[PDB]
Amino acid sequence: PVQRKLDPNTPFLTGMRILDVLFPVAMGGTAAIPGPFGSGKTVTQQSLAKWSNADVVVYVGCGERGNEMTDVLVEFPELTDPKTGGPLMHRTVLIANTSNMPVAAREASIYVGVTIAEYFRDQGFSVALMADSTSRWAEALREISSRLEEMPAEEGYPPYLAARLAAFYERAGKVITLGGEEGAVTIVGAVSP
Amino acid sequence: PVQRKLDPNTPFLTGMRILDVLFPVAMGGTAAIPGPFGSGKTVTQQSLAKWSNADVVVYVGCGERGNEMTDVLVEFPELTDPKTGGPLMHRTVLIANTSNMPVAAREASIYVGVTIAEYFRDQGFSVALMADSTSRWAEALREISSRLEEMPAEEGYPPYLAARLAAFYERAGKVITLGGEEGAVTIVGAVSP
Amino acid sequence: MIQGVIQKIAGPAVIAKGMLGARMYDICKVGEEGLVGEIIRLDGDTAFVQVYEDTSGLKVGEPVVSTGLPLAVELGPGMLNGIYDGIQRPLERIREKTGIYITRGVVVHALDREKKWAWTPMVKPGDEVRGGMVLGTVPEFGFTHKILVPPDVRGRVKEVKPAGEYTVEEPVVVLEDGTELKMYHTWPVRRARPVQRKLDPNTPFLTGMRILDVLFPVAMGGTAAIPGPFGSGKTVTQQSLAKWSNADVVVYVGCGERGNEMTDVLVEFPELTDPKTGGPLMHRTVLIANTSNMPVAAREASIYVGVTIAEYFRDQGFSVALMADSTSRWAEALREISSRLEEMPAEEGYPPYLAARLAAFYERAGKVITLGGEEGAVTIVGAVSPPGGDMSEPVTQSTLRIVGAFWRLDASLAFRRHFPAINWNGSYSLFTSALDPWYRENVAEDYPELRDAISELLQREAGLQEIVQLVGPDALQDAERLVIEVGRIIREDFLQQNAYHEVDAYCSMKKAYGIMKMILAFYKEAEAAIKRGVSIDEILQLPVLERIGRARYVSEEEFPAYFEEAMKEIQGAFKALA
Amino acid sequence: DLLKKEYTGITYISGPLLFVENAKDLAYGAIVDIKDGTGRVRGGQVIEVSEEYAVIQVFEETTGLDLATTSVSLVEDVARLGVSKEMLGRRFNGIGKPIDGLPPITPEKRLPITGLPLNPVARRKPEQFIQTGISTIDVMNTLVRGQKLPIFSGSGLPANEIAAQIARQATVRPDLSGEGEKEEPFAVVFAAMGITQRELSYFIQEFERTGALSRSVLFLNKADDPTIERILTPRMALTVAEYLAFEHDYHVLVILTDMTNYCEALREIGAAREEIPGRRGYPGYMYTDLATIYERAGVVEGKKGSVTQIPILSMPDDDRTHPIPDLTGYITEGQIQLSRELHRKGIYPPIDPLPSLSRLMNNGVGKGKTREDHKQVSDQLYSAYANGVDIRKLVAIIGEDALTENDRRYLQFADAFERFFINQGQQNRSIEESLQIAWALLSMLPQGELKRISKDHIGKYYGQKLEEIWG
Amino acid sequence: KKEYTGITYISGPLLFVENAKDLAYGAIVDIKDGTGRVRGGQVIEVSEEYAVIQVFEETTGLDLATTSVSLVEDVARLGVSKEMLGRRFNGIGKPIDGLPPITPEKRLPITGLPLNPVARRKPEQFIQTGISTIDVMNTLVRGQKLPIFSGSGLPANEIAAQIARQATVRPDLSGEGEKEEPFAVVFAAMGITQRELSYFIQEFERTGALSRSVLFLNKADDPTIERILTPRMALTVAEYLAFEHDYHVLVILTDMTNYCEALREIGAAREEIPGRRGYPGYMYTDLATIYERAGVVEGKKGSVTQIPILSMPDDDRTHPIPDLTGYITEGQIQLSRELHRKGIYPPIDPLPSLSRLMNNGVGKGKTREDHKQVSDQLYSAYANGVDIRKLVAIIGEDALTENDRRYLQFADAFERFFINQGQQNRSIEESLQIAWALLSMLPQGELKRISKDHIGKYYGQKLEEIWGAP
Amino acid sequence: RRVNALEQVVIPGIRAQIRFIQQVLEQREREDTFRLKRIKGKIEAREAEEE
C-alpha cells in the first residue's frame, strides 16, 4: 500500500539520447522492449542499469537460457557504478531462473522482483525494474494453467494472461509512501515472440 | 394439418427490383437473406412487410433491437395497405423478443409466429412470415443445450439444429386448406453469420 | 476353462461377468452362437470382449467361454491360391456353407483337412531338430513347401513317416519326448516369428513402375508407405505391385476396403501369368479380405494375420511382398473400439498406443537369416488414407517416422489423369545409396549418375516453376525454358505410366534406363544447340520429341532396336540444326 | 413370439434416447413399441442393453411421454422388413409403412434391414456399360451396372434434375456388347431422407411423366418427418433392392436423395451417446455405417439381377474435404462432382470432369463393349481440358494477348469443350454421338499433340469438324 | 521379498494393484504372470486404496488371478563407470553388445538435478566437427546446445554419424592448451528402425570411433517409456564423465521428434489434458530439463555439448517441437532439401543456419584471428550469389554486371566445394583455406567485411592448389 | 504495377486467409479440449461412484 499515486510529471532519464528525447518514459512509467538476437539488447539493458537516475536496480530473469543467464551473472558484477566508482552490483538485486528450474519459481519471479522493487520504493528510493523476458514468464503461466486443466484462450494462453500482465505492470508508478516520502518504480519489460 | 401441398406458381412480389426480377421467390416458397451487420437484412424485411402483395404479414423480431420494433409500431399505422387502402398495421402481426429479453423465449417466438401464419393460411389468406434473425434462435438453442450438458456438434450448436431449422422452414407452402380453400405461407428468414 | 455370462452389449463390445482368471487378448466364444471375441480389459470379475462378428440379436445372460489362447493362425500347406477373412477363415468354404452372404458363427478350418500332400521326409530317426529346421518337403503349385519345426520346439527325432500322401493332420514326425509334429503349426499373430539375424538391405524390390523403381526405390527387406486422398491411385499401385513385382509370394491384405477390389483380384489373377514361375499369378498370392462392411473389430486381426503369414513364408526362405490396402482403416477400428472402452483419446480420437502398434507392425519387415539358415525377406507397402487428404493427420505422421520409402500421391495430378500421380517434391527414399552397387552390377555402371541427373533436372524445374508462376514461361531465357520443357518431357514420358495399358503397365529396369539415357542425350544436345543461337521454338518441334514421348508404349523385346534408332535420330536431328 | 411383454420403469427421457431399467430380456438391436398414456404408439431400437438397464433410441419425437404411464413392449429381436414383389408401384414412409392409402403388403419374406455383407467370392465383376445419355458421364466417367456412383452437389445445384435425367435415359447397349438383346427397364428404388416438398414434388412429377411409378418403390422421409427414423430409410430401401435383384433377377437402380441428411441424424445419435467423434463432430463409426449402406450394391456370380446406387449428397460450402463427401469418396466407386462455376454460366448438366471419377470405367469400355478408342479418347480429353484450365490460370496473370498459339488453341479447346460437350441440356446422346463430339473437339488440336491416342485411332477418327455435327 | 498379488484392473498399459501403499511414486516394479515371465513397470500413481502401474511391453499374458508385482527400485538409477566407453545399451542401461555388464562405480538417478546458474561459466572454446559449413560459419562451442533441423527424407543420421566420427577438440590452437584433454561421445538414438540401428553400429565399429563412445540405442518397436528414459540416461553418463573425470563430452540426440511423440503418447495414456496441438502442456519444461543439462561449470575442466537432431514434421519451423527447441537452444543447423536433391552432402544451408554462441568461441587464440570476418563475408557473398541466381533466370547472364557474374560463379563454387565436402574430415585450417580460396574469386575491395590486414595475409590463392578434387 | 499489385492485393489477401485458417484450427483445438475434459470428468465420476 501507498498513500497516493502521483502523476507522470518527471522523466526517467536513461542517459541515452534516443530514449530520453524521442521516446521518453516518465518516472514510474512502463516501457516494453523486444529482444531480437544480434540487436545489442544486453548492452542497452546494462547501459540503462548503469546510467539511469534510479537509486536501486532490480533485474528479473524469468526462465532464460542457461548461457544467457550465465552471461548476465558474469557481466553484471563487472559493471562499475559511476556514482561511487565501485561495483554496480552493490545497488542491484538479481533474480535468476533458467528454463529447467521449477515452473512455479519461473512464474513467481516477476512478482518477487516487483515486490522487492516496491519495498525499496517504500524506503523512498527510485527503482528501475527490468524483466528480461516476459514471454518466458508467459510460457510458464501457460504451462501452469495447462496443468490446472483450464480452457485456453487464443494460442494456448489462459484467459487471465492480460489480467496477470496488468497486475504486474500497474505496480509501477511514482507514489507518496506510507512514510510520507516520495518513491517510484519504473518497469522496463522485454518481450521475445 | 392441410389437405394437400401444391407447387407454387405465382410470385411473391416484394417490391424490390433485384429480388423480384433476378432472384424471385414464389408465393409459397422460402428464402434466406444472410449477411453481416449493416448489410440491409432488416430494411429488406421491413420493405417486404410494407410493400409485398401478401394479405397478412407476420413479423418475428427474434432477438433483435427494440428500436426496430418501435420503428414498425410507429410508422405502420400511418402507412397504407397496398391492396386494401387501410392502415398497414391492420394486416400486420408483430412478435417481439428483443436481444435483452429472456433468451429462451427466442425459440418460442419463432414457433408462435409460424403457427399464427399457418392459422391465417388456413383461413384462406396468403401470409408472409419474416424471421428477423434465425441466428438468435440458434444461439438460444446453443445456450439451452449448454445448460443440458449435451455434446455440441459444431461451433457449439446442438446436433439437431439443422432438424429444427428444416422443420421450421417446411411449414411454408401453398396448400389446400382443410376447409377446401386456397392459402399460402412465405417464409423469409434472415441469417446473421 | 473360464466360463462367464454376458453382462452388457453395445455394438462390437461385450462385457462378460464371472470371468475371473481369464487372460488378456485371449480368444472367447461369445453367446450361444459362439462368436469369436478377444479380451481387451480385465476389471474385477468382469472382462471386456471385442467381438469379431456382428452382435445384433445377442441377449444378456448368454454364456461366454474363454479358450485360454490368443489369436493364432494355422501355418502350413494349403494357404496359397486362397482368400481368407480377418481371422483366417477360407471364404470359399464359407460361400459353400452359407451362400452369397456372410453369416455369423461359421466354423471352418483354415487349412483343408481332406486334401493329401506328397510328403517327402528329410530327417531321420535320432536327428536333433531345432526351431525353424526343415522336416520335409511338400509340393504346392510349383513351390517346394518346407515343413518347418515350430520355433519353440526342440528334441530328437524318434520316427518319421515314409514318403507318401498324407493330410496336414498326419503326425509326420514324432520326437523322443512324445510331441507329434504335423504338416502345420499354430502361431500367435501378435508375436513376431523369431529370426536368426537381420540383414542389411542390398537388393531392390522391383515394382515395375518407373518412378518407384528409379526415383524412390524400396529395398527387398524395406518398408514403404503410399498415402493419398481418395481417387489418387493407392489401390491400383498396390495391385500393380502384386501383379508385376519380383517377389516369390504376395500377401494382399484388404483391411476395410471395397469388396469389388478383392473380386477384381479373384477374377483376374488366375488368368494372369506369374512373372518368374510361369504359372497362374494367383498361385503365388494369398488374399486376406475384411471389407469395409465386414465387422470392424476384425481389421486389426486381418492385418496381423497377413503379417504372420508373410513371416511364415519368409521363414520358408522366400521373399514376400505384403500389401496393406489401408492401415487407416485399422486406426479407425482402434478408435471405434476405444470409444466403447471409454478411454481418454489421443489426437483426433485415436488411442495413444496407435503409434506403438504401427511401429510394431512395420518393424516385422526385413531381410533375415531364418532359423533354418536360409535367407528370406518381407517387404511391407502400407497404404494410408488420411481424412480429407490431410497429410498432417496422426496416422500419416506416425508412418512417416518409421518407413524407408514414402510415396506421396497428389490429388491435383490425379485430377488431370496424370498417373501414378506421385508427388515428386513430397516423396523420398532412404534406400537409394544402399542399392547403388546392385544397380551398377545389374543395370549399368553409370545408372546412378543418370538417376541423379534426372533428379537434378527435376529440382531445377521445381526451382524455375516459382518464377514461371510469377511471370509466365515466355519471360524466361532459352536455357531456363529448355529446363522447363525437358522437365515436362520427363514428367509426361518417363514418370507417367498407364497401369491398364497392355505394354506400359510393366517396365523393366533396362527399358527405364534407356528412356532416361534418351532424355538426357536430347537435353545435352538441346543445351549445346541453344548455346549457339538455335531457337528453342524449333527444337520442340523435332519429331524425335514425339519418338521419346511414345517410347513408353514399346514392348520389352522390341525396345532395344527402338532405343538404338532413337539414339541415332537424336544425334542426327541436332546435327541437322546447323 | 405370440406373447407380448411390457416394460414399465422408464427412468430417463432426453432427446432421442430413453432408458428402461428392468429389460435384460430385450435383445441388442431389438425393435420396441413405446406407448404413452394417450395410447399413441412410437417405435424405437435397442442400442445398448445390460443387466441394469437398456438404452433405446426413439424414432419419433418424444413429446407427451412421461415416466409414470409410458410402457415399452418388444416387437422383434431383429429389425426386419416384410418384402414382396408387390412392393412395386407402392409408396412408403421412412419406416416402411404405406402412405398411398393402400392396404399393407403381404410379406413373402421378412428380411433383416441391416442385411449381410456380400461374400467377395460370390461377387461378380461389374461390366455392363450403362448409357446414361450424358457425355461427361458416358465418355469420361462411365457408369457400369452394379456401380456405386454418387453425385457430389451443392446447395443450389441441380443434382435432382441430373438424377432424374439419368433414371429416365439410362439403358444398356446389348448391340455393342453382344449380350442378350432385351429391353427390360430399370426398377427404381427411391429413398428420400429429409427431402423437402419442393424436391419431392419434382421427383414425383418426373416419375409420373416417365411412367416409372409402376416399376418404382418409394421410401419417403420428409424434412418435417422425425430425424432419427432416417437411420432406417436407406437400410429398408437397400433391403428391398437386394431382394428384388437377387431373388427376382431385377436390374435395380437405387437413388438416395441426401446422404448429408442421413449423416446429420447419425451425428445426432452419436452426440447423444457421447461417441468419440471424427472430424467436425461426426461419430468415428461414420465410415463403417456409410460402408454398410453403400457396399450393398453390385452383381453376384450366377445371378442375373443387379443393384446400382446413385446416392446424392450436398457438399457443405462446396467443400470436397468435408467428412461426408470425403468418406463417401473413400467408400464409393468414383463420384460425379458438379461445378458451381459451370452452373452460373448456364451449362447443364454442370458436371466438372476433373474432380469426377469412375473407378469401374475400365471394366465396361473398350473393344467389344463400347468402342475401341473410348479409353484413349477419354484420357486425351482429360489432358487437353486440364491444359486449358491451366492456361486459363496463366491468362489471369499475363493476359490473353500474350499467349502463344499452342496456349491459345488449348484455351479455345477448353471453351468449346465446356460449351458443347458438357453443355447438352435435356437431350439424350448415344455413346456414338458423344464420341463424335469428343473427336470433333480433339480435332481442334494438332495431330501431334494427341500423345494419349494411338496413331491408328487418330487415322480413323481425327479430322472431323464440329460444324458437321451442327451448324 | 514382498509380493503384491491384489491386481484388480488391467487395461491398455495400466494395471491397478491394491494394498500397495508401500510403493513409492515413480518406483520401478517387476510384473510376473502365471507363466513365470517377468515384465517391467513404473508406478505412476499411489493412493491408500490402490497403486497405478504403467507397464512396459504388452500385457498379453496377464490375468487378475495369477499376476504378482514386486518392487525393483524406488528411484530409476543408472550404474555409471568409465568402462561404459566402447559399450552399447538399449536405452534403459541393459547391454546389447553381448559383453558382460559393467561394474558400477556409483549409481546415479537418471533424472537431472538442475545446474546452479552461479556455478556455470561462459562457453568460450570451440569443437571441430570436421564440417566446413559448421566449423567456419556456424561454429560449435563447448557447452553449447546446437540442434540440427532436418526433414523426413534428409540424411540426418549420416551427418550425425559423421560428426560423432570426426568431432575433436583442438588444444594446439588454444594459445598453448592442455596437451591432451579427454574427449568422449555419447550417442542417444530414440525410436530408430532396425536399418538405422545397423547403420550406426557399422559406422561406429568400422573406424574405431566406438572406443571413445557410449551408445544408447532405443528402437522404434521398443517400449515408449524406454524412449523417454534414453536421453536422461545418456545425459547422466555425460554429466558423470564431464564433471567427475574432466571429459569433454559431445552428446548427440538422434531424433527428438520421436521423443516428443513418445512424451505425447505417455501423457495421453495417463489421462492428461494436452496443451497446444495435442502436445503436453509441460513439453517445454521437459525439453528444457533435457537440453539444459549441457554447459561448462566454473572450477571444472570438463564440458557437456549437445547436438539434438529433430525432423520437422512437415518442414514447418513453427511446429511446437522445433519452436520450443529453438526457444531453449542456442541457434540451429538447417538442412536443405534443395541442396540434398542437387547431390550436395552434407546438405547444410548456411543462410537459415545460426550459432548464437559462435562469437565467444572463435578468434585469436581460439581458432584464428580471421575466422569471424571470413564467416561474415562468406554469408554476405553467398546471399548475394543466390539472389543473382534467381535474377539471371529472367534477365539473362549478359545483362548482369561483371561483379554480379563474379557472385554467380562464387555461389556455384561455394556450393560445390565448401558445402559439398562428402565424407572428408576437414581441419579448421583446411576449411579456412578453402573459404579464402573461394573469396579470392571475388575482386579485392569487394571484401568489405574483412580487414585489410587479413586480406593482405590470405587473399590470392586458387582453388586448384588445395582442393580435394576438381 | 506488378510490384504494387503483389504488395497491396495479393500478400494481404494470403495473410488474411492464413489468419482465418489459424483461427479455425484453434477453434477446433479448443473444442477438442472441452471434449477431453468432459471425458475425464465422466471417467472420474464412474470410478469414484461405482468403480
Ligand SMILES: Nc1ncnc2c1ncn2[C@@H]1O[C@H](COP(=O)(O)OP(=O)(O)OP(=O)(O)O)[C@@H](O)[C@H]1O
Ligand atoms: N435498401 C436500402 N435502402 C437504403 N438504405 C439501406 C438499405 N438497406 C440498408 N440501408 C442502410 O443500411 C443500414 C443497415 O441496414 P439494416 O438495419 O437493415 O441492417 P442489417 O443487415 O439488418 O444489420 P444487423 O445485423 O446489424 O441488424 C440501414 O439503417 C440503412 O441506413
Ligand SMILES: Nc1ncnc2c1ncn2[C@@H]1O[C@H](COP(=O)(O)OP(=O)(O)O)[C@@H](O)[C@H]1O
Ligand atoms: N497407374 C495408373 N494408371 C492408370 N490409371 C490409374 C492409375 N492409378 C490410378 N488410376 C485411376 O484412378 C482411379 C482410382 O484409383 P484408386 O486405386 O481407387 O485410388 P485409391 O485407392 O487411392 O482410392 C482408378 O479407377 C484408375 O482408373
Ligand SMILES: [Mg+2]
Ligand atoms: Mg437488422
Ligand SMILES: [Mg+2]
Ligand atoms: Mg482404394
